[PDB]
Amino acid sequence: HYPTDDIKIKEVKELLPPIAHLYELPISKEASGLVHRTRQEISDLVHGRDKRLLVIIGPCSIHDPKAALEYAERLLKLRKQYENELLIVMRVYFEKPRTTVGWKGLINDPHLDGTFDINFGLRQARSLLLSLNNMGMPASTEFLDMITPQYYADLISWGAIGARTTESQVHRELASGLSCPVGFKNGTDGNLKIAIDAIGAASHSHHFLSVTKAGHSAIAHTGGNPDCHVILRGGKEPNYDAEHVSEAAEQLRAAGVTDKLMIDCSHANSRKDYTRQMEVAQDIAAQLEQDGGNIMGVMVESHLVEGRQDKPEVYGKSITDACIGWGATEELLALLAGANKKRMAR
C-alpha cells in the first residue's frame, strides 16, 4: 500500500478557532459604531454620494504593534483635523505577498524569527485592530486567503484584494461576502479589466469554502458586495494621471459599474521609490483642483520613519516596502486636504 496523502507536507496543525479570539476580544460598542459608520461613509464615496477623499494610509506592513499604535495616535489628529475634506483610515496590513523567500508577516510569524506562531499572530492581529478602533482609528487590510477574515474582518472598515489575486475566482467570491467595502487592484502589468471584472463578479451572490467561527470546515453563501471599486496601482507604466483616470472611468461605465476609483501613490505608480509618492499626490491634487470627479480615494505607504530596512532594527521603519516618514505624511495630507476642499466647494 503506497502513500499518496500529504507527501510534501511537514505537518498540519490545528489552530485556535475564530470564536476563541472573539470571546477574549469581543468588538466593543464603540468600535462597532466606528466600523459600521466608516463602512457607510466609504460606501458613500464609492457611489458618489459624498466628495471627501478616502485616504488609506500607513505602513506597508505592520511588524510592531507598539509602533503601529504610536503611528495611529499621530494620524488620528490629522484624521480629525481634515475630516471635512478627507476620510482617513489606517493601513493595517499584516503581510506583503512576495515571490522570493522572506518574512511572512505578523499573523504568520509574529516573532519575526521563523517560529510561525500563528495562534499568537492571529491573537495579536485582532488585539491591535480592536485597540485601533477603540482609540477612534478605523483600520484597513488586505485579505490574502479565505480563512483569516473569520478572525478579524469584523474590525475592518475597508478591505483590499491585491494585484496578484484580483483575477482569482475564489478571492472575488470572498469579496462578495466581506462586510466592508473592497478595492480591487489592477494587475501587476497594468491590466485594468481584471479589476473591472472583479467588481461585477463580487456584486453577485457566491459560495466559497472556509470555516465557521467555531473553526469547522464550511461553505459560505454570500449576498454580494455592492461597495467594490478599482484601485489604480501602475504596471508597465503608471496609471495615476488624468488621462489614465479618464480611460479607466470610461471602461468602468461601459461595464455598468461605479466609475469612482482609488489611486495608489505607492508600488508601481511610485516605481518603488517612496519619494515619488508625493509627486503622485501632487498630480492627484492638480486633478482635484481642475476636475477630478472620478477620484474617490488614494493609498499611501507611510510610517514613523522613512525608507526601509532589512532587519527590524530602527523603531517605526518598514521592513517591507519603503514608506514616507512622518513629516512627509503631514505635508502630503495637507496637500490633498487643500486641493479637495476646492473640489468639494464646486
Add this chain to the structure above:
Amino acid sequence: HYPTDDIKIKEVKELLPPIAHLYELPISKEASGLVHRTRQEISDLVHGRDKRLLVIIGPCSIHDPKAALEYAERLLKLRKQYENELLIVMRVYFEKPRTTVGWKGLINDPHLDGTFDINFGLRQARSLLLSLNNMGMPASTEFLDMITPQYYADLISWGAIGARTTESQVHRELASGLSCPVGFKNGTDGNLKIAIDAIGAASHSHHFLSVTKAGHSAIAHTGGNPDCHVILRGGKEPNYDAEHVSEAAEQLRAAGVTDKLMIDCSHANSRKDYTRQMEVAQDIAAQLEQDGGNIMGVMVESHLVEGRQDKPEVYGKSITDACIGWGATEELLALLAGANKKRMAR
C-alpha cells in the same frame, strides 16, 4: 451595539469533514499504486528523464459521473495502446472558473439546479476519482481553493493551477504542498513570468491556512514541490508554436527551473474554438517530428460528443467549454502518438 460581522453573508454552513468521505471511500491498494506510480512517471517527464508525452485529456468539466466513467473506459484502451509514446491521464475538473454568472460545477452544485448540495458534491467527486483510479485511469484536476484538496488530492496524479490563480501567493503556497506534480498556466493575457515565478516559489517550503482531515481550522507547513512546470495556454495571441516554445524554454533556463513545458491545445490557443484543437495538435506534432525537445505534455478538451450545450440534455456533451468528440479524440491521440514515437527513436 452595531452589527459588523457577516453583514453580506446569507449563511455559513458546516460541511462534513474530509475524514468522513475518507472513511467511506478509502483509497484502495490498487488506486494508491497507480497514483504513486503515475506521479513518479510524470516527475520523470518534468525533469526530462523520460520522453513520453504527458497528455491531460478529457472533458472541460465533469457534470455527469456516468458519462465520465464511459469516457474513461474508452480512453483507457488508448492509454494502454499508446503507453510507450504517451502518458494519458484523464481530465477530471469539477468546475470552470468564470467571470459571469453560471453553473459552479459538480462539487459546488452537483444536482445542476442551484441547490448547492456540496456534501453530496464532495462525496461524488471522491467516489468518481476512486472509481477512475480503480479501473486503471489516473486523474488530473485543478485546485481552485485550499480546502478541496483535503477531500480528494490523495487520488490526483497531476494538478493544475489555472491562469487566473498562478500569480496568487496562496495558490503557490498550496502547490508547494500538493502531493502531485503541478502545472502552472501562463496568465490570461499571455504573461509567462507569473508561471516561471510560480515554479520557483512552489519549490520552497511554505505555510497556508486550511483544515485538518478532521475538518478543523489549521495551518499547513509544506516541504516544497520539485515537480512543477509551466503550461502555455495562449494570451491575446496563441503561444503554441515553435518560436513561442523556444522563447519560453529560454526564459525557464534563465530562471534556473525546468525548461520542459506543456501546451494547452484548447482555451486561448484554440481561440476558444474546439474545431481548432486539432490544428494546435498538428503544429505540436510537427515540432515533435523536427525537434520539440522542450515539450513534455499537452492538454486537450475532449468528450463523448463534440460541441457544447447550455443545458445538460445530450449525454456526454459539455455544458462548459466546447470539446472535440470521441472520433476526433481517437484521431488526435493517434497523431501525437505517431509523432512522439519518432521523437523518442531519435
